[PDB]
Amino acid sequence: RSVFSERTEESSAVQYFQFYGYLSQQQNMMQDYVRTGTYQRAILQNHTDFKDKIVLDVGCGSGILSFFAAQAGARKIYAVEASTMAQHAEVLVKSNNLTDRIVVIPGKVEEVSLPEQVDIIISEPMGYMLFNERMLESYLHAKKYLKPSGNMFPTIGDVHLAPFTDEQLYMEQFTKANFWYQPSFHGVDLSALRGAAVDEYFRQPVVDTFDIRILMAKSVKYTVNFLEAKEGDLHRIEIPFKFHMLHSGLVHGLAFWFDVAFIGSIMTVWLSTAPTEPLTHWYQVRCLFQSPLFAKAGDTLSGTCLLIANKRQSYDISIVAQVDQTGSKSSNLLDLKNPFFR
Amino acid sequence: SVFSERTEESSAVQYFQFYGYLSQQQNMMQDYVRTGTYQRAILQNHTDFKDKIVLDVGCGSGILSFFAAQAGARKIYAVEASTMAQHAEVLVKSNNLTDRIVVIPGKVEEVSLPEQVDIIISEPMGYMLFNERMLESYLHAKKYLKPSGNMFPTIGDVHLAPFTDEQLYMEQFTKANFWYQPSFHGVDLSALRGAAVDEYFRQPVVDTFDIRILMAKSVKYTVNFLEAKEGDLHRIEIPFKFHMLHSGLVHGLAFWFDVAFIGSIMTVWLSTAPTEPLTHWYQVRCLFQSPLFAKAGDTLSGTCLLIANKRQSYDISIVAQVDQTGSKSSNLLDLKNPFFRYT
Amino acid sequence: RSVFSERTEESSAVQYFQFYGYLSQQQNMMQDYVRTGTYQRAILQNHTDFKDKIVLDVGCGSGILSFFAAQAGARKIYAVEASTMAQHAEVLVKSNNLTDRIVVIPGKVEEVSLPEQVDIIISEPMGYMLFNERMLESYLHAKKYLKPSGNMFPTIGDVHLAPFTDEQLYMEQFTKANFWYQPSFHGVDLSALRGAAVDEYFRQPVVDTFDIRILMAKSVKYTVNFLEAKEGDLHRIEIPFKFHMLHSGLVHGLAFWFDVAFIGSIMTVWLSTAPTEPLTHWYQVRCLFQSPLFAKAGDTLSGTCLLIANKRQSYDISIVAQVDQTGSKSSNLLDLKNPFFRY
Amino acid sequence: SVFSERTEESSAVQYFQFYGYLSQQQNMMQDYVRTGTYQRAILQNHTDFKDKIVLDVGCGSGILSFFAAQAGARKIYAVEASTMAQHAEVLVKSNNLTDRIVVIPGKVEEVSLPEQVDIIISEPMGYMLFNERMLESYLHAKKYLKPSGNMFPTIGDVHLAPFTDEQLYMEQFTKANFWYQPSFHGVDLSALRGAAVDEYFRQPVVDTFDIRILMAKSVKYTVNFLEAKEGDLHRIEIPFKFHMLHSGLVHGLAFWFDVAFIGSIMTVWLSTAPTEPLTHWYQVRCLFQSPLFAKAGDTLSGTCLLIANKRQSYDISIVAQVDQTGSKSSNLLDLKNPFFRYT
Ligand SMILES: COC(=O)c1cc(O)c2cc(NC(=O)NCCCCNC(=N)NCC[C@H]3O[C@@H](n4cnc5c(N)ncnc54)[C@H](O)[C@@H]3O)ccc2c1
Numbered sequence A: 001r002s003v004f005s006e007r008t009e010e011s012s013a014v015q016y017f018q019f020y021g022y023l024s025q026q027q028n029m030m031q032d033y034v035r036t037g038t039y040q041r042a043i044l045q046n047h048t049d050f051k052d053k054i055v056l057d058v059g060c061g062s063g064i065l066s067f068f069a070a071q072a073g074a075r076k077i078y079a080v081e082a083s084t085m086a087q088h089a090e091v092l093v094k095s096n097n098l099t100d101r102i103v104v105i106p107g108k109v110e111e112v113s114l115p116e117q118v119d120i121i122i123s124e125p126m127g128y129m130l131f132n133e134r135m136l137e138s139y140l141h142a143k144k145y146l147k148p149s150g151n152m153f154p155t156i157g158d159v160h161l162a163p164f165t166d167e168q169l170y171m172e173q174f175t176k177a178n179f180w181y182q183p184s185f186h187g188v189d190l191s192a193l194r195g196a197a198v199d200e201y202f203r204q205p206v207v208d209t210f211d212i213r214i215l216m217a218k219s220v221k222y223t224v225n226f227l228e229a230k231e232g233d234l235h236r237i238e239i240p241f242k243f244h245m246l247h248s249g250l251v252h253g254l255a256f257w258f259d260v261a262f263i264g265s266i267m268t269v270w271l272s273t274a275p276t277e278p279l280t281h282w283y284q285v286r287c288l289f290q291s292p293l294f295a296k297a298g299d300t301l302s303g304t305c306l307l308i309a310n311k312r313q314s315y316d317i318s319i320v321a322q323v324d325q326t327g328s329k330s331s332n333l334l335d336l337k338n339p340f341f342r
Numbered sequence B, D: 001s002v003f004s005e006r007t008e009e010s011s012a013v014q015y016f017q018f019y020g021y022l023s024q025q026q027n028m029m030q031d032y033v034r035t036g037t038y039q040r041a042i043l044q045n046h047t048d049f050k051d052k053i054v055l056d057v058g059c060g061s062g063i064l065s066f067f068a069a070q071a072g073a074r075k076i077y078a079v080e081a082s083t084m085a086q087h088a089e090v091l092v093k094s095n096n097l098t099d100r101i102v103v104i105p106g107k108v109e110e111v112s113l114p115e116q117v118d119i120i121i122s123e124p125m126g127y128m129l130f131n132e133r134m135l136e137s138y139l140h141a142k143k144y145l146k147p148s149g150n151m152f153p154t155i156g157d158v159h160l161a162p163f164t165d166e167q168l169y170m171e172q173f174t175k176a177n178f179w180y181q182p183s184f185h186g187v188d189l190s191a192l193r194g195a196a197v198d199e200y201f202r203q204p205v206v207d208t209f210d211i212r213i214l215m216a217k218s219v220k221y222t223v224n225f226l227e228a229k230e231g232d233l234h235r236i237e238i239p240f241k242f243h244m245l246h247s248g249l250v251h252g253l254a255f256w257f258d259v260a261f262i263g264s265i266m267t268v269w270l271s272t273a274p275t276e277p278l279t280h281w282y283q284v285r286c287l288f289q290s291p292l293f294a295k296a297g298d299t300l301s302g303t304c305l306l307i308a309n310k311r312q313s314y315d316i317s318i319v320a321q322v323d324q325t326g327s328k329s330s331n332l333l334d335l336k337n338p339f340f341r342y343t
Numbered sequence C: 001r002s003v004f005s006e007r008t009e010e011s012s013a014v015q016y017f018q019f020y021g022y023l024s025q026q027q028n029m030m031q032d033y034v035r036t037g038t039y040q041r042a043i044l045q046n047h048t049d050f051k052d053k054i055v056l057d058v059g060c061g062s063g064i065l066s067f068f069a070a071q072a073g074a075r076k077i078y079a080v081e082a083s084t085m086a087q088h089a090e091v092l093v094k095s096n097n098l099t100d101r102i103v104v105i106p107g108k109v110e111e112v113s114l115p116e117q118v119d120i121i122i123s124e125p126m127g128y129m130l131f132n133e134r135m136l137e138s139y140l141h142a143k144k145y146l147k148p149s150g151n152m153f154p155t156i157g158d159v160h161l162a163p164f165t166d167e168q169l170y171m172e173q174f175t176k177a178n179f180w181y182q183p184s185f186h187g188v189d190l191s192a193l194r195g196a197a198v199d200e201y202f203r204q205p206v207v208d209t210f211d212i213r214i215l216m217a218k219s220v221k222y223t224v225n226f227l228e229a230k231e232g233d234l235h236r237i238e239i240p241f242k243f244h245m246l247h248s249g250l251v252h253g254l255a256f257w258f259d260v261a262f263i264g265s266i267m268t269v270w271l272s273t274a275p276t277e278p279l280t281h282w283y284q285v286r287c288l289f290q291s292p293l294f295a296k297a298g299d300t301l302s303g304t305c306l307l308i309a310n311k312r313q314s315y316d317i318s319i320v321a322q323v324d325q326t327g328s329k330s331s332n333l334l335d336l337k338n339p340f341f342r343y
């Protein structure tokens, strides 16, 4: 009956919260120094946004952001967490002698009761490609607990798209699919499945990093203002794009990354997963075209990236792109729920 | 159905989604030991298939059914519960075998077969042989087997042996000691160190390793698929008494398995032992919480108890002791959540 | 009509003899020092096979082999050539003061008149893969002028086949065809032609050289004895093969090269185009499989290479190969008339 | 037919075999200047195609017919004489355009068209514009053109200019001097040196080059395809009077061409000039066998005479003189046998 369960299949949720119940996954996220250090800087350098304030930490995990809020002077922090990690967060609150200031509240943020409205919401809601996990909907849902002029850390998110050329990545995924081109694998003709194999492989977003030299145009930016967005905004995300090509060659797909900003009273602090910046546990994401497009420097590559949220806490991706000057058109569907970790 | 009574829905959804991918089929088909040995077992025992009725349990892409067709089978019922069943259909059509291979979507515990069969073929083995609890579906399928029908594979041998791997043992604490710092960005994490150690030690380690870490001849626990019942696999008690061949510290038990295709013409073996080329089953190792010192000639005795759970896997309870000294160790592990260490 | 024209399309012959009418092509063949030096050695070191003998030079071109025969003491050499190069040969015979000994006879060797029978035939009848050009049939046809005791230089030819692995060559030809995979080339769906494009590209034998590292088994040898063969023997050439694989991996096709032997009275001299030998203007030839075959070291790769002569002075190639242990079968057709020059 | 009267069978067979290959279509399609400019010319002049009847002469894969369809043509007759016609048919089906594009196999001089057309489109240009004598087929097709009708391309400009390239000139003799040796394996080849020089100089050099080798503003010879008759192209006389911008030795004449698509909305140009990005037409250079010294301000005058031959090409006769000194040079070249020097 909760907003969460209406939009989420049980089996997806079971797996999701089992995964985040493990201390090893917490360690993996916490040891990303860019991630953890930038969150600490954003909070501590904006200490006036926390001094004597009431805070909500959405999906707190081990509790680390709540401890930063306490270091910054927060009067009271409600730390909401739906996995079994909530019990471990409690252990740390006791052992850091902060029971008077951090209150763990087990459950889904769409389902728990909070005793009061809060001045500021903090969270790490970003998934791969920003939107994976559909955790941004829970962060926005939590605004029901935000006082009128309250703040959100992070405050905004920028998704960046850019066209890329990477023949080796293309031929790797292409070579895999041509396994099913074989007419006599131990005497068995597999070729009738070649098309279905190519489809399956090229639907997989490629999660890994890459040199910026593969980017063929300045990135296009789609911005979510978390102070203003509603959950429903994220069920169907339409991102138009028009790229002015800076290099001639084959376009093998689009690359995705994101930035978020903590717009504080004292300063704005940015956390970037761009390929120009040190690697993070978010890496970067690339959606391959099944057939590359040829473009000349100075051509425009235009189209639309459509993200449709699904009940597996992820998105179906539709990318339609064309070279305006020639009319070369490519349409592509990808399943962010089955990424290829390269 | 028998399947749903013993399986959580959420476990089954994930399980069959995973096997719905062609890439996972390709990963299994590319294992030359796995695919080549199944082909040899069937083709070299052609009299067990000529003009016979066959059941392929969990046929995936259909590959074992095609081998049965190459061997002269009159009719093959290929049962598959994932969406891979539709791809198997495509291949049957394109290999012009619709008159001989019938794909039947669904669980073998739930579908109807028109006919009793002469031989069941399947690949029911998981990690440590028993993971996935697919062996129960393979045995369940015997309700369709004619009296004196055969099973391919016919038996399975799970092998246990003690191992020494100081680096693997110490790696657990190096990972857990992440939590043993008093000011991680100002936060004392040390209260969680013990919980982290516990969590790493509950995970069996899927990996391969050099046979020089093995400290005694393996002990063998055998399932004869012609004779076993599903119920035999709900509680699997494997006693062991190891005569130690080397002195040193024993850090846990290593697992692998063999299966045999006992045909009329010959018996063909498929081995995942560490003395053999690697397979997609690798090997499995379960650590003790505290190592045991043993001398060459001592005996290390105890039991490995595998208790089936509703997550298509087993809870593993290992108790071991050095008889000559009384040094005792145990561990509890969740086979459903293995740690993939191979690189 | 003559034997040549009944087996040859006019349009093929016009082009063929126009090509050989050019001095630049003569230079290209003559500057191959292996080719020219070995022909000279074969003749001069077997001088007794030429001293005071009557010689026929089939397809003499510029006349070089006739001049070697004259250096070796031949009484008379009939130099037959069907291209306009016959007129340049004439010039050289007069400029080298050998008119009393070398008699150029313009025309096809299947059509000209020789005044007498000869003691020995010399020629360079080898094309790419030995058989291209169907010049070997003209060389054998010329035996009608050979005395009972007569000899032939070259005397025999060995064609060698061996399996090879060359992922980069395969992906190169494969990448070219996938141009026609495009669903919107300037708005035009080309993909319905993809299959026809792959066929066309993989029908092309690849002429170039390569490191012997890529060979996966000892070569198999097919021998033509020019003293004994008849023209008809070369209309349908069937080369069985059974390779014992020395390395595991993908087999992307078969590699071809040849040797010829000049079996003289004094010694036998060999001319090899093997990839273990210095490059010649014959290079080597490779026939790709559209789908490579996986084989293990110790497997056997067996099948047949079938060469069917066509009216374009070349051969349709059929290669059927299978990995005996798995039954993986590959069938391939190639047009030797349309080679891909990669060097 | 008009085609067979003017074309030797053997030339045509080879010509249409070459264009039968998808790889040659792909090579022409990948030339972005060629394909992009044709697309722009048609699409930007859409009013010349909307609901119109179109004839595509020598359509190959059909690409220009698809551009005409993108531009709204009611009906397109796509004529192609090679086997590529069958592949065009496949693409028309798979692009769901059978109601609008009709592929007609055969020579445009021999096929029937059911009706007159509003506009003819073709790519009739060969090297130096005229090679292949395809322009005569394009003009021949005007019998199907309505009185009002247009042609895409509408005109062609051939450009000639004098060039200096000492290294290109000397390269001829370096190659020929292979023959100038008195004992090549004992054989005096030198009598053929002059024949070799002649043969190299008869070949037009297909290559690109830096515009700084040009020594005078080009002279332009124009063919208006709306007005020319086939017979106009049997004997093409191009007078020239160059006003030399640089002093030096003139080693020959360089050739290139432009065509214009004169539409109702705009005129679009396709240039193969050396100042423009390279195309698969490159540029062509015809050497003089003796260079001419000229000073800046001198005039180099003469005639380039192109005589069509039955090999779908031209015999080229260039006669040039420096008016101020009387220094004359002649040259006879065969456009059918170009030398491809580009690397
Ligand atoms: C086999 O292939 C596949 O199927 C697959 C697909 C993937 O994509 C895979 C991806 C992986 N790794 C990955 O993504 N790493 C990068 C993580 C970026 C940072 N994520 C982050 N902090 N988000 C929020 C999380 C925290 O918020 C809590 N929470 C959520 N909702 C809540 C609610 N309603 N109330 C309260 N608490 C709630 C959670 O419990 C938790 O503590 C691994 C494996 C993958 C496998």
Ligand SMILES: COC(=O)c1cc(O)c2cc(NC(=O)NCCCCNC(=N)NCC[C@H]3O[C@@H](n4cnc5c(N)ncnc54)[C@H](O)[C@@H]3O)ccc2c1
Pocket: B003, B016, B019, B057, B058, B059, B060, B079, B080, B081, B082, B084, B106, B107, B108, B109, B123, B124, B125, B126, B127, B131, B132, B134, B137, B280, B281, B336, B337, B338
């Ligand atoms: C996040 O951590 C985790 O949670 C986790 C845990 C693991 O352990 C993970 C392990 C993996 N890899 C692995 O295991 N590799 C080794 C494979 C060995 C060979 N397996 C085999 N052939 N067995 C049988 C399967 C076939 O039988 C069908 N079938 C089953 N019942 C049926 C029924 N009732 N009717 C009809 N058809 C039925 C299935 O649909 C399928 O076609 C990867 C990821 C893993 C993740």
Ligand SMILES: COC(=O)c1cc(O)c2cc(NC(=O)NCCCCNC(=N)NCC[C@H]3O[C@@H](n4cnc5c(N)ncnc54)[C@H](O)[C@@H]3O)ccc2c1
Pocket: C004, C016, C017, C020, C029, C058, C059, C060, C061, C080, C081, C082, C083, C085, C107, C108, C109, C110, C124, C125, C126, C127, C128, C132, C133, C135, C138, C281, C282, C336, C337, C338, C339, C340
């Ligand atoms: C893809 O595009 C394509 O279509 C193509 C296909 C090719 O394959 C291409 C191949 C090329 N080059 C090549 O292969 N070079 C290496 C071979 C040299 C060694 N061969 C050799 N000496 N044979 C004998 C030749 C001499 O014997 C004469 N002759 C023949 N019969 C006669 C008769 N009945 N009476 C009298 N005289 C006769 C001839 O006139 C001549 O003087 C180039 C371009 C190619 C193009």
Ligand SMILES: COC(=O)c1cc(O)c2cc(NC(=O)NCCCCNC(=N)NCC[C@H]3O[C@@H](n4cnc5c(N)ncnc54)[C@H](O)[C@@H]3O)ccc2c1
Pocket: D003, D015, D016, D019, D028, D057, D058, D059, D060, D079, D080, D081, D082, D106, D107, D108, D109, D123, D124, D125, D126, D127, D132, D134, D137, D280, D281, D336, D337, D338
């Ligand atoms: C033997 O080896 C050597 O010595 C040689 C000599 C050369 O010179 C060599 C030259 C080459 N390369 C080259 O020339 N590149 C320049 C690009 C030209 C671009 N223009 C273009 N596409 N031509 C238009 C023709 C198209 O119209 C069709 N058609 C013709 N008439 C038709 C009719 N009556 N009805 C119907 N259809 C007809 C044809 O089938 C075809 O589709 C390569 C290799 C060469 C080799």
